[PDB]
Each structure stands twice: as C-alpha cells, then as structure tokens.
Probable thymidylate synthase
Amino acid sequence: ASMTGSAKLISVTKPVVEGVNTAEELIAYAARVSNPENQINNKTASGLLKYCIRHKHWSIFETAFMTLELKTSRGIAAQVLRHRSFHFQEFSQRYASVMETPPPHQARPEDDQTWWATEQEKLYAQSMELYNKALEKGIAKECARFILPLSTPTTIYMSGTIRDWIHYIELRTSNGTQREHIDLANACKEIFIKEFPSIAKALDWVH
Amino acid sequence: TGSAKLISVTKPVVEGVNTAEELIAYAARVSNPENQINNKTASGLLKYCIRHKHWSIFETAFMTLELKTSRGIAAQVLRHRSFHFQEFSQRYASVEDDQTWWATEQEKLYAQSMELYNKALEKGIAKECARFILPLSTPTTIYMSGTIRDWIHYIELRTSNGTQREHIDLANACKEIFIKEFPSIAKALDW
Amino acid sequence: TGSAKLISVTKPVVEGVNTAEELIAYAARVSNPENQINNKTASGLLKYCIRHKHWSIFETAFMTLELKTSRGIAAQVLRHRSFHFQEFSQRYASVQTWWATEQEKLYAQSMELYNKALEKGIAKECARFILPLSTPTTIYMSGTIRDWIHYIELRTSNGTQREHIDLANACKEIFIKEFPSIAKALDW
Amino acid sequence: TGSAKLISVTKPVVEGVNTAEELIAYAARVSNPENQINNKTASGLLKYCIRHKHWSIFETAFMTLELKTSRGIAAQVLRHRSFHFQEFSQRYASVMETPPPHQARFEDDQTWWATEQEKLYAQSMELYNKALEKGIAKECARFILPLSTPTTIYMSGTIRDWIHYIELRTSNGTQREHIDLANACKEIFIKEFPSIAKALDWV
Ligand SMILES: Cc1cc2nc3c(=O)[nH]c(=O)nc-3n(C[C@H](O)[C@H](O)[C@H](O)COP(=O)(O)OP(=O)(O)OC[C@H]3O[C@@H](n4cnc5c(N)ncnc54)[C@H](O)[C@@H]3O)c2cc1C
Ligand SMILES: Cc1cc2nc3c(=O)[nH]c(=O)nc-3n(C[C@H](O)[C@H](O)[C@H](O)COP(=O)(O)OP(=O)(O)OC[C@H]3O[C@@H](n4cnc5c(N)ncnc54)[C@H](O)[C@@H]3O)c2cc1C
Ligand SMILES: Cc1cc2nc3c(=O)[nH]c(=O)nc-3n(C[C@H](O)[C@H](O)[C@H](O)COP(=O)(O)OP(=O)(O)OC[C@H]3O[C@@H](n4cnc5c(N)ncnc54)[C@H](O)[C@@H]3O)c2cc1C
Ligand SMILES: Cc1cc2nc3c(=O)[nH]c(=O)nc-3n(C[C@H](O)[C@H](O)[C@H](O)COP(=O)(O)OP(=O)(O)OC[C@H]3O[C@@H](n4cnc5c(N)ncnc54)[C@H](O)[C@@H]3O)c2cc1C
Ligand SMILES: COc1ccc(CC2=C(O)C(=O)c3ccccc3C2=O)cc1
Ligand SMILES: COc1ccc(CC2=C(O)C(=O)c3ccccc3C2=O)cc1
Ligand SMILES: COc1ccc(CC2=C(O)C(=O)c3ccccc3C2=O)cc1
Ligand SMILES: COc1ccc(CC2=C(O)C(=O)c3ccccc3C2=O)cc1
C-alpha cells in the first residue's frame, strides 16, 4: 500500500496547573471541577470522557488545542481547508516555490493504471519545466503557480481544539471518503491516539 | 476575468422593515433606544456602530454570492474561515514578448492536461482521480456565504494594495453587489 | 414561559428558487449532476445529505429568531457560539407555593431597589448587578440552518432544562414552517 | 474587581522552537522562506504580520485563562464567540461566595447603594440556601441569584483572538469591571508573549 498522506505533531496544549501535566489530564480536570457534585466523577479517565462525548458536554474537549503538520496534495488540501473550525498555515504564495516534483496519483486495468502514471509524469515534468522557465524569465511565483497541477505536494499546519479533531478524524476515516484523505486522517488519528489515550479508548480507536 | 452574482440575502419579516440593511439599522435602534445616535441618518448610525465595534447588528444579516474564479485565487478565498462555501462535487462533476511566451506556453500546457483529463474520463477513471492533473488556473465557481460584518472585512482586506490582482478583481465584483444591497453601509465606509 | 418569533430568513434572488429551503434543495442537486441520488424527493435528498454529513448546503441558508426567555436560560443559549446574538444595550435599555411566594417577594424587592437606583441617576450597567437570573430577556438569535438543526435537536432532547425545552420547541415550530422538507428529513 | 490566572498554553515540539510565541515567529519564517522581513526580530516580524493581516501564524498558538468575575460581566465575555468557555455545572455546582456590592456611577449615595446591595444580596443567599434545604434543584435555585454573583470561567482562545479581546476590552468607554478583567488578562498575555506585547506596545 502507497502512503499518500503524512502528519506530524507540531504543538499541543500544556497545563500550568499543579498536578495536571497533559492536555488530556486538563480535559479530565475540566470535567471533574465544573461538575463536582456528580457521581460520574468517580469513573475511569476514558469512561468519564466517554460519558461527556455521549452527553454532548463538548466544552471540556475545547480547553485543549493541537497543531499537526500535514504533507499531502493541493487537490486534497482543497477538502481539508473546508473544515472551518480549524486554523491553517501554508507557504507564502509569493515567497515560496515548489521544490518536490509532483508524484503520480493512483486511479479507481493494470496497463490502464501504468498509462495514467506515465501520462501524469509526462505532464508534471512539462509543468515543472515551464515553472522554472517562467521563474528564470522573472515571472513572480504567484503568477507561475497557476500551471502547477492539483497533485502538487503540499505541507500545511492544521490547528484545532480536541473536539474539532475528534469529528474531523471520525469523518475522514469513515467508509467512502477519498483514499488520499483517509491516509491523511489515519496519519492524524495515529498522532491523536498517542497524545489522547483515554479519548482514543472512549471512542474505541486502536493503533 | 473574475466575476460575482448575488444568489441570496436576508429578508426580514418584521412589519415595516423590508431589506436586510433596514434590519441592521432597526437592530441598532431597538437594542439602544435611549441612545442619542438613533437620531442620526441610516449611514450615520452604522458608521458609528462600525467605529465602536458593535459588530453584532451586522451579524443579523447574511449574503450568498456566486464567485467565478480560478483554483489559485480560491486557495486564498477559502482561507476566510468565517464564510461558508459551496463548490461542485469532486466525484459527480466535470470541467512584453515574455508575456506572449507565458500565454502561448500556458495554452499549450493547458490543452495537454485537458486532453489527458478527457482521455482519463473515457477510459473510466473516476473524476476525483482525474482532477489531480488540472492546473491551479482551472476555472471554478463557488458560493461564498457569510454575515455582513464578514463581507465588510473580506472586501476591505482583498481590495487593499498588495493583494494579488486577480483577487482584487473578484473582491471589486463583490464590492459592487455589496454597494447595491447595502448603500447606507457603503456610504458609512466611504466606498 | 419561553417563546420565539421569526425575525428574518434568507431569500434567494435566482430564478426558479424562491424560498431558503429551495436554495438548499437547489444546492444539494446542482452539487451532484451525475449522481442518481439527485432523483430522490426534496426531503429524501436532504435526508441523504444530513446522513452523509454534506453540511455546507445547510450553510447557504440563514435564519434569525427573537427569543423571549430569561437570563438563566440565556446562560445556556449564549453558549451555542456558532450563533450570532443581538441583545438590548447594557447601557441604553431598562427592564412549590413557598418557592413561587418567596420568589415574588424577592423579585418585587429587586425592582424597588432597581427603580430607585435609576430614579437616583445610577448608570443602567450598574443597576443590572442587582438583577436576578429570572429577569426576562428578549434576544435575537441568528445562525445558519445547519446550526439551527443541531441546536433544536440538542435542546428538545430529554435531560435539558424544561424552560430551555419550551424555548427550543418554540424554535422547532418556526423551523418546521420554513423548512418542511428538512423537518421531514429529520422526522420532526 | 476581577482577576485572571493562566490555565494552559500551547507547547511546541519542533526543534529550536520551545514556546508558543517562538512557534508563532517560526510559523511565519517557515511559511515565507524567500522573504527579507524574516531577518527582523521576533517583535519586528510579528509587528509586520499584525499590520499586514497575516493572522494565521497567530492562530497556531492557544491559551486558556481562568477568570474570576461577576455573572453580569461573564454575560459580556461569553459574546466573544471565537473563544471557548468552561463553566461550573448549572445542576452539580453550588454558589458558595456571597455576591459583593458593585460600585455605582452616573459618598452618601454610594453608601446607600452598597448597603442596599448587601441587604438584597444576603436576602437572596438565605432564600437560595433554604430552597436547596427544601430540595429545590440547583438549576431551579439559581434563578433568584443576582447578576453580581461571582463566577469562575475558563476562557480558551487562539493568540489572534486574545490580541483583539485585550485591545477591545482595555479600550476607552468599556465597563470598569470589564477593563479590570481585560487588564488581568493583558498582564498574563504580556508575560507569555513579550515580543507580541512589544509589537503592540503593551507593558
Ligand atoms: C498580506 C497577507 C499575507 C498572508 N500570508 C500568508 C502566508 O504566508 N501563509 C498562509 O498560510 N496564509 C497567509 N495569509 C492568509 C491569512 O493569515 C488569513 O488566514 C486569511 O487572510 C484569512 O483571514 P481571516 O482568518 O481574517 O478570515 P475572515 O473570515 O475574513 O475573518 C475571520 C473573522 O475575523 C473578523 N475580522 C477580521 N478583520 C476584522 C476587523 N478589522 N474587525 C473586526 N472583525 C474582523 C471577521 O469579521 C470574521 O468574523 C495572508 C494574508 C494576507 C492578507
Ligand atoms: C460525503 C461528503 C460529501 C460532500 N460533498 C460536497 C459537495 O459536493 N460540495 C461541497 O462544497 N462540499 C461538499 N462536502 C463538504 C462538506 O459540506 C463540509 O462543508 C466539510 O466537510 C466541512 O465540514 P464541517 O463544516 O462540519 O467542518 P468542521 O470544521 O470539521 O466542523 C465544524 C464544526 O462542527 C463541529 N461538529 C462537526 N461534527 C460534529 C458532531 N457530529 N457532533 C458535534 N459537533 C460536531 C466541529 O466540532 C466543528 O466545531 C462534502 C462532505 C462529505 C463528508
Ligand atoms: C448535558 C449538557 C451538559 C453541559 N454541561 C456543561 C458544564 O458543566 N459546563 C459548561 O461550561 N458547559 C456545559 N455544556 C455546554 C456544552 O459544553 C457546549 O458549550 C454548549 O452546549 C454549546 O455547544 P456547541 O459548541 O456545540 O454550540 P453550537 O453553536 O450548537 O455548535 C457549534 C458548531 O458545532 C456543530 N455541530 C454540533 N453538533 C453537530 C452534529 N451533531 N453534527 C454536525 N455538526 C454539529 C454545529 O452545527 C455548530 O456549527 C453542557 C451541555 C450539555 C448538552
Ligand atoms: C461599544 C460596544 C457596544 C456594544 N453594544 C451592544 C448592544 O447594544 N447589544 C448587543 O447585543 N451587543 C453589543 N456589543 C457586543 C458586540 O457587538 C459583540 O457581539 C461583542 O463585542 C463580541 O465581539 P466579536 O463578535 O468581535 O467577538 P470576538 O470573538 O472577539 O471576535 C470574533 C473574531 O473576529 C476577529 N476580530 C475582531 N477584531 C478584529 C480585528 N481588528 N482584526 C482581525 N480580526 C478581528 C477576532 O480575532 C475573532 O476571530 C457591543 C460591544 C461594544 C464593544
Ligand atoms: C501579489 O500577490 C499575492 C500577495 C500576497 C499573498 C499573501 C497571501 C495571501 O493574501 C493568502 O491569502 C494566502 C493563502 C494561502 C497561502 C499563502 C497566502 C499568501 O501568501 C498572495 C499573493
Ligand atoms: C471517492 O472519493 C471522494 C468521495 C466523496 C467526495 C465527496 C466530497 C467531499 O467528501 C468533500 O469534502 C468536498 C469538499 C469540497 C468540494 C467537493 C467535495 C466532495 O465532493 C470527494 C471524493
Ligand atoms: C435539568 O436541567 C439542566 C440540565 C443540564 C444542564 C447542563 C448544562 C447545560 O445544558 C448548559 O448549557 C450550561 C452552560 C453554562 C454552564 C453550565 C451548563 C450546564 O451545566 C443545566 C441544567
Ligand atoms: C461602561 O459600561 C458599558 C458600556 C458599553 C457596553 C456596550 C456593550 C458591550 O460592550 C457588550 O458586550 C454587550 C453584550 C450584551 C448587551 C449589551 C452590551 C453592551 O451594551 C456595556 C457596558
């Protein structure tokens, strides 16, 4: 299997409160402090948080925030951007040029797929050739980028609260979503499981 | 060239108040009845509410505009996270002398990708997979939906100097619609 | 008892599209031309879009409602941050049997002190500080149809405070009148 | 009349990047590698980005603050819709702290107001306490509680959002108890973000 989606942790929330060391301990803390005269406080870390998700007490999961660096394609980025709750950071359209050569994209026919690879590579090299030819002649990076295909490799910072991350990963890992995006979301999920064990457990998410 | 068409706007049902703008003025008056600012003109009130950052009255009205642009300018557009967008389905929908050189070489490249794009479709390749070869300049049409507060700030940002020319043109075509539906706010902002 | 009144809704300007629900239905069909699901009822198509989390169509429409509630219920209401709200200026605008009895006795005394403070020329923003959570409040609640679906679904479900249930139910009725096909796709 | 206390702030993992502010300055530099502006100080780069509306690098950092205020002010604060909030349960929490008297604006008239506030406030407390004793639900018992009732809230938001909240709420005209609260936030903000404070001229 091809890996057409990568993610890396950039930052995550860190509590300054005594005894509470991680963002997930803060989500746990937020829940028990706000609702002290509740029997549900006595439950396990995962169990408490599961109850909150089940009951829609979302705000505790918004006391935490995580930035992940995503490596994907412009055509996929197009979908990612539509997740309005998140905040993003991308390369300057004027002070940054495309380094990586666009890779061939798989289709949804053994000699039909091979053709699609060869033909893409052909067109990509042609766009890349003309991209640098335009740069050499003085054309601004913002004008030159218009010839770059949708397969253009891209790195973006995707920043959002934990609640938002829960729903983005739930959606983008569900049956039917584009593969170059399920790869991305699963790459995100791996980082999430790590940082949030008790949430991963309450949502039933395995490595 | 980049263009915009009005698709929908807020229309109040409170008797006497007909347009979305009238409602914004109404909302600023009814919430502040003992305020001397209610005496002034429609534009006077709103210019005042804008200066003092009373944004909520501008949040009682919403507007959808259809933008005809390119994927590269839309790369910017989609970044104004306060707006709601509606684009076509990825799966169910199909598409001096150096300056002369840049155009000829663009058309040549663009004809090739479009050919291969069509070649891929006839072969049975899914549209979402076929899109991947299309340049950042593939023409796009999107619905941009947001509150009047949001539009004021998008237009103010995207029409300022430094903005990519092709986005300025888009923003200016949004400004013309905004000036038509909200003339008292255009007068208030000096547009 | 909490009530709601429709202030304003989205109205399309495009030919063949007259109501805000038609614009949603329009957007949901124009999205998928090659799609076969495009040949379902107005409500069937929308039921599919809700199911498949194709929310953006429900964000082409926007609605305002005037809520007649209390400050104690507004403390829940104001927490639905996807909504925009408009309230009377804090500066330029002025306001079982044992429980009901002792409550009136306190509330009436609260007004004597409130009215005296304004008679004395105290600023309204200051005179609000003596006011109880029970104090009535008329607010404007504006949000996209997506945000309205989720607020009503949450605030009508068992467990929420009755006073908030009444408020949300009063919002549900307006929604049902403006969006029958969405109300039907949601089984309301 | 209102205090703030830091609860949590974003913590980067990138090498050479140790703080939320350092990450903001980093996000701006990695983003535009072929730009001269990057060779200014952390404060300079950030002043440039603020002035030119490059807001997204300010949306890579997040802060949570516990605010100690009145229900009357909380009501204003809750309107800052880009922020996320965490409050005590309306059901499983009880108001211990007796509401204090608020200062009126337009000594003997001021005294009248404080005395009358203390009277009405205590009266509401005894009735609150008795309704609880009499088995009335904590959510139904809070309706007799006044707008002066002390409240502790978690206010969580991106650094961009905090810049504008501090600026608006410390600006001329703002209600006094709100300025004080906005100032107690300004104090924490400056400590965590000195080069942003420097670019905005906050000290
Ligand atoms: C000169 C420039 C350089 C940029 N460089 C980069 C880059 O290198 N990399 C990158 O990834 N991105 C870059 N961006 C994009 C940028 O940081 C934003 O992400 C983009 O401009 C979207 O803005 P926004 O979040 O303000 O969205 P909007 O949706 O327009 O604003 C969000 C909210 O903020 C409010 N708001 C905005 N201004 C005001 C105001 N004055 N008063 C009150 N409310 C206001 C709006 O009304 C709205 O509710 C750049 C933008 C510009 C203009
Ligand atoms: C199958 C599918 C088909 C699509 N087809 C089209 C098309 O043809 N054209 C088009 O323009 N777009 C399409 N889209 C994009 C879609 O309309 C959304 O706009 C995009 O998915 C962003 O989702 P969102 O706005 O919920 O984003 P997010 O930012 O992920 O979510 C917004 C907010 O909602 C909250 N939230 C989301 N889900 C939940 C939940 N279950 N419970 C509690 N809170 C929640 C989040 O926490 C967040 O604050 C499609 C999407 C899907 C999944
Ligand atoms: C039982 C209960 C107990 C609570 N206890 C506390 C407490 O002790 N302390 C406290 O501070 N707060 C509490 N809250 C409040 C809660 O944490 C939220 O702050 C509040 O209800 C507002 O929710 P929201 O952010 O989902 O707002 P909204 O404005 O309704 O949501 C923001 C966005 O999420 C999207 N969304 C939501 N649900 C869905 C969905 N199902 N599918 C797709 N999109 C969706 C919306 O459409 C909207 O765009 C409680 C809430 C409940 C229901
Ligand atoms: C003088 C005054 C009078 C008011 N009167 C009333 C009244 O009579 N009735 C009533 O109901 N409400 C009133 N309000 C409240 C008001 O209209 C807003 O609802 C409240 O101030 C919250 O602001 P916000 O939506 O900007 O929220 P925020 O969460 O602070 O802002 C939302 C977004 O806008 C962005 N933003 C804001 N300013 C800028 C900027 N300069 N540049 C870039 N981004 C920016 C933020 O960064 C954030 O992402 C008043 C407020 C003031 C200050
Ligand atoms: C003169 O042409 C220009 C001028 C400035 C920019 C600045 C800029 C934006 O405004 C923007 O939204 C953006 C969105 C996503 C990545 C980068 C940028 C980005 O770098 C892009 C083209
Ligand atoms: C087979 O792979 C697929 C499957 C579903 C889709 C559906 C879809 C999304 O999910 C999406 O976010 C999106 C975002 C913006 C425009 C269109 C779409 C869009 O059409 C796209 C490719
Ligand atoms: C039985 O009536 C109830 C039922 C549930 C609640 C739960 C709850 C909300 O729903 C809510 O928005 C809220 C908003 C701000 C603080 C606390 C709460 C909060 O605690 C409060 C009273
Ligand atoms: C000096 O006292 C003041 C001065 C001005 C205001 C203005 C103001 C806000 O700023 C605010 O969020 C607000 C929220 C809800 C209703 C009214 C207001 C409102 O009127 C409030 C108190």
